[PDB]
Ligand binder design. Structure first.
Ligand SMILES: *[C@@H]1O[C@H](CO)[C@@H](O)[C@H](O)[C@H]1NC(C)=O
Ligand SMILES: *[C@@H]1O[C@H](CO)[C@@H](O)[C@H](O)[C@H]1NC(C)=O
Ligand SMILES: *[C@@H]1O[C@H](CO)[C@@H](O)[C@H](O)[C@H]1NC(C)=O
Ligand SMILES: *[C@@H]1O[C@H](CO)[C@@H](O)[C@H](O)[C@H]1NC(C)=O
Ligand SMILES: *[C@@H]1O[C@H](CO)[C@@H](O)[C@H](O)[C@H]1NC(C)=O
Ligand SMILES: *[C@H]1O[C@H](CO)[C@@H](O)[C@H](O)[C@H]1NC(C)=O
Lengths: 73, 351, 358, 355, 72, 73
C-alpha cells in the first residue's frame, strides 16, 4: 500500500517511507475518583458459627488499602 | 312371659353397650396418642428443622453479600490490585483504570485540533500504552488516582525508519532509528523504545530526540556528502552480516564467508557476491550468512485450541402433593359430619 | 300372651322403650365406626406428613447444609490464602521474576523489618524508610522453591554506596550548529563525577535522586567547566555538529529551552495572556512559571502539564436481606390442649356411663 | 316371684340403661370434636409446610444453585479470565508469555514444531523461563464465547557460540573503554550487544537478540590486550585528569585507584584485608566482599539477610446433618392403628349381641 | 564452572568467558484459541429477589469482553 | 524550594541543581516463605452431586504450582 521500502547500495542502508507521525510533547492529567460499595454485616447466626465472611472480606480490603496508604509519602 | 323376655332383652342390650363403651375408650386412647404425635411432629418443625432453615437462610445471605461485594466493586478491586503490584504507578493505563467510554470523553476535552482528537480516538491501544496511571489519594471508601495521557504537539508529518549494514575498510552508519519532520528541521529517535507504530502511523515521544537539519537525508545516497557530517563507524577489517528490514532484508557478504537467500518452497534461490544487497520478503523467506540463519519472514506455526463446555445450574424444586392431601382431610371431615348424624338419631329415639 | 291387670300399660310401654333403645344403640355403633374410619385416614395422613418431612425434605435441607459448607470453605480458601494466591499469580504472569516488589510480595511491616537488618548507616536506613515506593521500584523478586503446601521466593533490595551527594541533570539544545550530547544525570562519586546516560536508571522523588551505578561512566570534575565553555581546554566535550540551520525546543525540569534559528517562527504563549514572547535568533530559556506553551513553527510544545476533566464513578452501599421463618407454636399448643380436653371429657362420659351399669 | 316387682325392677333397668346410653352419646360427640379440631391442625401443619417452609427451602436451593455456578464459572474458566485480565491491564500486548497465556505442555508442543534443529529444540526446552521472557503475546480476535490471541516465540539463527561479557574501568591522562557489554561469535565476526537488556543469561547460557546489535570484525579483541592497536580502532573515553571508580563484575570486581583517593578492600568476617596502591587491580569475589573507593562502598557480593516466614493453619469445615426419629414415630402410629383395629372389634362384638 | 574471569591491565578491562550463545534472528507465531465454558441459566426465584448472581457475573464478563473489543 | 535551573547560552544547555543522591552499589537479598492454609475436602453430597467446589479449587491451585515448578530449572 502506502508503505514502501527503498534500498541504497551506496550506504548499505534501507529506508521505510510512508508513515504519518504523532509527536508527544505534553501531558494531559485527569483526576479519576472511585467510590466503594460497602457491606454492613447482618448479625444473625449462620450454618457455621465460626465462619465470619463479611468481616473477612472487609478486613482483606481495609488491609490492601493500608498497604497503599503506606506506599505514598 | 312378657316381662321375662323383656328382662332378657335389657341384658343383651346392656352387653352390646359395655362392648360399645369399650370401643369408645379404645378409640379415645388411640386418638390421645395420635394427638401427641402431631404435637411431636409440629415440635420437630419448630425446635429442630426451622432453626437450621434460618441459620442456612442467614449463611446464604453472607455468601451473597460477599460475592456481590466482589461483583459491584470489580473495577475498584482490579485497580487496587495493579496499584499494589506496580507499586503506585502503572503503564499502560488498563481498561479498569480508564474505560473506553471515558477515554474518548477525555480525548474530547483535551486542548487540541479535531484531527488530533480523531487520530487519538482511532488509536486507543497506542494512546494507552503511552499513558501512566498514578495514585494520588487512597482512603477506605474512596480511591482517587490521576490519569496522564499524551498530548501530540504535531501530527500527520512524514516518518521513516533507517536500517543500516556494513559497507566494504568497512563503514557501518550508526544512525539507525525513526525520523520525523518537525517545524522546519527533522527529529531523530535513536532508542527504538520511544516509538510506537500501528498500521502506517508512528507515535514518537520527543523527550530524548535529536534535532537534525534536513540534509541528514543525503547520507542515504552518499556518506562523503558535503552538507552533513554523517555519523559513521569505521573498521580496518572486513565483516559480513544481515539486518532484517521491515519489508525484506539487507545482506552484506564480504570476504570468504558464504551467504545465500533461501525459500521455504524453492530452496536456496540465490548466492551473494561481495557487496551490499537487499532482498524483499515477497520473494525470499530466509537468508543464511555462513552458519547463521535469519528469517526474512515470521514463521506461522501450529494452531492450538482449548475447548470448553457449558455449566448448568441444578434446579429441581420441591412439590407437595397437597390437592390429594386436602381431599383426605375433607374425607375425615365427612366421616365426622356423618358420625354426628348417627349420634343425633340415637339421641332422638331417647328424646 | 298378656297378663292383666298387673300394670299392663307399664309393661307395654317398656316393650316400646326397648325397641327404641335397641335402634338407638345400633345407630350409636355406626357413629363409632365412622369416627373410627375417620381417625383411621387422619392417622394415615399424619404419617405421610412425617414421611414427607423425613424422606423428602430432610434429604434437601441437608444437601444444602453441605453445599453451604463446601462454599464457605472455597471462599475462605480464596480469602485466607489471599496473599499467597496473588503472589503465585504474578509469578505466573512474569514467568518467575517480577519487578517491582509488590505489596503482596513484601508488606511494609516487613520492608522496614528488612531495612533495619541491612548492613548500612542510621542515615541510609532513614532514607529508605521514607522512600519505600522507590526502593520497591528498584527491587526484584525471584521465586526460588515452590512446593504445593509452601512457597518460598527471594526478595532483592538495593543497597546504596553513597548518599547525600550533590546531583544535577543536563538538558541541551542546538546552538547556531553545535549540540551538546552528554545529556543526562550527573552525580558526585568520591572525588569524581558519575554519569548515568540512559533515562531509565535514575528515579527522582521530591528533591532526591536514586541512580544505578551498574553502567555509569566515571568522569573528572572538569566536565562542569563545559556548561560555561564548549571548547574548555581541560576536557574534550562531545558535541554534535551540522553544517546547516536547525530550530527546536526542549522541556526541562523547571521550564524549557527554545533554539530559534533561521526563517522559522517561534513564540511562547501563556494560558491567560496568549503570546508573551516572539523569539529572535538565539538560545533562550523560559520559566515554567510564566510560560505554559512554546510553539516552534507549526508544532506546539507544552511547558506545563495540562489539567483535565475530573471523572467520578459513584457506588452505593449494598444492603443484605434474608427472611426469618417464625412458627405460631403458642396458638397451636392450645388447639392441641383443647383436643386433649375433649378426650379427657369424652372418657368421663364412658366412665359416667359404666357407673350406671350399675 | 312377685310380678309387679318384675315390672318395677325391669323399669329400673331400662332407665339406668338409657341414662347410660345418653352418656355414651355425649362421649362420641365430645370425641367427634376433639378429632375435628385435631384434623384442622393437621391441615394447618401441612399448610405451614406447603405455603411457608417448602417455598423458602426452594429459594435457598436456588440461591445455592446461583452461588455454586458463579464459582464453578470462575473455576472452570480459570484460565480464560486470567488471560482477559492481563490483556486488559496491558492493553492488547503482553510480555513475557505467562503460564495462562501458554501452559508448559503446550510450549514444548510448539518448540517441537518450529523449523529448527533437534539441538535447538533441546535448548529451548531446557530454558523455558528464558524463552518466555523473550516471547510476546498479542490479542487478535475476542468475542463473547471465544478468545483467540497470537503468541510470538523467538527463533535462534545460531546456537553454541562463544560469548563474553566485557567489563572495563579507567586507566591512568586517563583512559576508559566505553564498549562494555556482550560479544558473540557470529559467523565470521563478533556481534556486539550494547544494551544489557537485550541479553538474557541462564547459567553458562546466553540468549541475545540480534536486532539492535553492531557487527564487528574479530580484531575487536586485540583491544583487550592493548588500547592502541594497528588492526582495530578501540572505542575509548579520554580524560586529562585522574579518576577512580569500581566496576563490580560477574566473578569479582575492578578497582581503579589514582591520586589522593583511598581505595581498600574488606571482608565481612576479616575486615580490611587490603589497601590499594595507585593502580588497576582486580579482586575476586571468592576473597573480598566489599570495596570502599573513597567513601562510596561497593558490594562485590550480594548480602544474604533476615529470612521471613508466614504460617497458615488448616481451616476446618463443620457439617452437622439433621436426622428425624422416624422409627419411634411409626411404632406409635402402629400403636394408634392398634387402638382402631380393636376399637372396631368391640363394636362388632356389640352388633352381634343385637342379633 | 565453565564461566571464567580474566583480568587485563593493558586496557584495565575484566572479561567473562565461557558462555554459549543462542541468537534470535526470526519469530514463530502460533495462534491460541480459548473457548468459554458458558453458563446456561435455569431462571428461578431465590432468597433475595434483588440478587441475581448468575446474571451479574455474566454481565460483568460480557462487559470486560466489550472493553477489549474496543482496542481493535 | 531547593531545586533550581541554570541556563547557559554559551553552550545552550540547562542544568538542574539541588538533588541529594543515593547510588546503588550492591544488592541485599532475603528469603520470604509462606504456607498454604489448606482445605480438607468435605465428603458427603450437596444439592448437585456433579459439583465438587472443594476439589476443583484445589486442582486449580495444585496445577498453578505445577506450572510454576516447570519454569525453575
Ligand atoms: C444467635 O444470634 C445472636 C446474635 O449474634 C446471638 O446472641 C445468639 O447467641 C445466637 N444464637 C442463638 C441460637 O440465639
Ligand atoms: C387430662 O386428664 C388428666 C387426669 O385428670 C390430667 O392430668 C390432664 O391435665 C387432663 N388434661 C388433658 C387435656 O390432658
Ligand atoms: C389391623 O387390621 C387390619 C384388618 O384386619 C389389618 O390389615 C392390619 O394388618 C391390622 N394391623 C394394624 C394395627 O394396622
Ligand atoms: C418464581 O419464579 C418464576 C420463574 O422465574 C417466576 O415466573 C415467578 O414470578 C416467581 N414467583 C412465583 C411464586 O411464581
Ligand atoms: C454422594 O453422591 C456421590 C455421587 O453420586 C456418590 O458417589 C456417593 O455415594 C453419595 N453418598 C455420599 C454421602 O457421599
Ligand atoms: C359438614 O358439616 C358442617 C357443619 O354443618 C358444614 O359446614 C359442612 O358443609 C358439612 N360438610 C362438609 C364435608 O364440610
Amino acid at each position: 500500500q502506502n508503505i514502501t521500502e527503498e534500498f541504497y547500495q551506496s550506504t548499505c542502508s534501507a529506508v521505510s517511507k510512508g508513515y504519518l507521525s504523532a509527536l508527544r510533547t505534553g501531558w494531559y492529567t485527569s483526576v479519576i475518583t472511585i467510590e466503594l460499595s460497602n457491606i454492613k454485616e447482618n448479625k444473625c447466626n449462620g450454618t457455621d458459627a465460626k465462619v465470619k465472611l463479611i468481616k473477612q472480606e472487609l478486613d482483606k480490603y481495609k488491609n490492601a488499602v493500608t498497604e497503599l496508604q503506606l506506599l505514598m509519602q | 312371659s312378657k316381662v321375662l323376655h323383656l328382662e332378657g332383652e335389657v341384658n343383651k342390650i346392656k352387653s352390646a353397650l359395655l362392648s360399645t363403651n369399650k370401643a369408645v375408650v379404645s378409640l379415645s386412647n388411640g386418638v390421645s396418642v395420635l394427638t401427641s404425635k402431631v404435637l411431636d411432629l409440629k415440635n420437630y418443625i419448630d425446635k429442630q428443622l426451622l432453626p437450621i432453615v434460618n441459620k442456612q437462610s442467614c449463611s446464604i445471605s453472607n455468601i451473597e453479600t460477599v460475592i456481590e461485594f466482589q461483583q459491584k466493586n470489580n473495577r475498584l478491586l482490579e485497580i487496587t490490585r495493579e496499584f499494589s503490584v506496580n507499586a503506585g504507578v502503572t503503564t499502560p493505563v488498563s481498561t479498569y483504570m480508564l474505560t473506553n467510554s471515558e477515554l474518548l470523553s477525555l480525548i474530547n476535552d483535551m486542548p487540541i485540533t479535531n484531527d488530533q482528537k480523531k487520530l487519538m480516538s482511532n488509536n486507543v491501544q497506542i494512546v494507552r500504552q503511552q499513558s501512566y496511571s498514578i495514585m494520588s489519594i487512597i482512603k477506605e471508601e474512596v480511591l482517587a488516582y490521576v490519569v496522564q495521557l499524551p498530548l501530540y504537539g504535531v501530527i500527520d508529518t512524514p516518518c521513516w525508519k533507517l536500517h543500516t549494514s556494513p559497507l566494504c575498510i568497512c563503514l557501518t552508519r550508526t544512525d539507525r532509528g525513526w525520523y520525523c519532520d518537525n517545524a522546519g528541521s527533522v527529529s531523530f529517535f535513536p532508542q527504538a523504545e520511544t516509538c510506537k507504530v500501528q498500521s502506517n502511523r508512528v507515535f514518537c515521544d520527543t523527550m530524548n530526540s535529536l534535532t537534525l537539519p534536513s540534509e541528514v537525508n543525503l547520507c542515504n545516497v552518499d556518506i562523503f556528502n558535503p552538507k552533513y557530517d554523517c555519523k559513521i563507524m569505521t573498521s580496518k577489517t572486513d565483516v559480513s552480516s544481515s539486518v532484517i528490514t521491515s519489508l525484506g532484508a539487507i545482506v552484506s557478504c564480504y570476504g570468504k564467508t558464504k551467504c545465500t537467500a533461501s525459500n521455504k518452497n524453492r530452496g536456496i534461490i540465490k548466492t551473494f557476491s561481495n557487496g551490499c544487497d537487499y532482498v524483499s520478503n515477497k520473494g525470499v523467506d530466509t537468508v543464511s550468512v555462513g552458519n547463521t540463519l535469519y528469517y526474512v519472514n515470521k514463521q506461522e506455526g501450529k494452531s492450538l485450541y482449548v475447548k470448553g463446555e457449558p455449566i448448568i445450574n441444578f434446579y429441581d424444586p420441591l412439590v407437595f402433593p397437597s390437592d390429594e392431601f386436602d381431599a383426605s382431610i375433607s374425607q375425615v371431615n365427612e366421616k365426622i359430619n356423618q358420625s354426628l348424624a348417627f349420634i343425633r338419631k340415637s339421641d332422638e329415639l331417647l328424646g
